[PDB]
Amino acid sequence: YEHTAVMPNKVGIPYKALVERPGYAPVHLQIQLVNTRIIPSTNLEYITC
């Protein structure tokens, strides 16, 4: 039942998928990507002023 799901990157809205496990009752999702903060790899090269 490991519910793989392609999923649009968009922040402020849930994505209520559905678990179709064969055998037991299905269960809904509610996946809201509340944030997409990134934090790339960087380097402080020089301050200027």
Subset of residues 6 to 45 that bind its own copies, contact rule: CB under 8 A: 21-25
- Spatial neighbors of 15 by CB under 8 A, at least 6 apart, are 5, 7, 8, 29, 30, 31, 32, 33
Q: At closest approach, how far in Å is the CB of 17 from its own copies?
A: 17
Nearest CA among 43, 1, 37, 35 for reference residue 18: 1
Check binding of 46 to its own copies (CB under 8 A).
Answer: no
Is residue 3 a contact residue for its own copies (CB under 8 A)? Answer: no
With binding defined as CB under 8 A, does residue 1 bind its own copies?
Answer: yes
- Which residues are at the interface with its own copies (CB under 8 A)? 1-2, 21-25
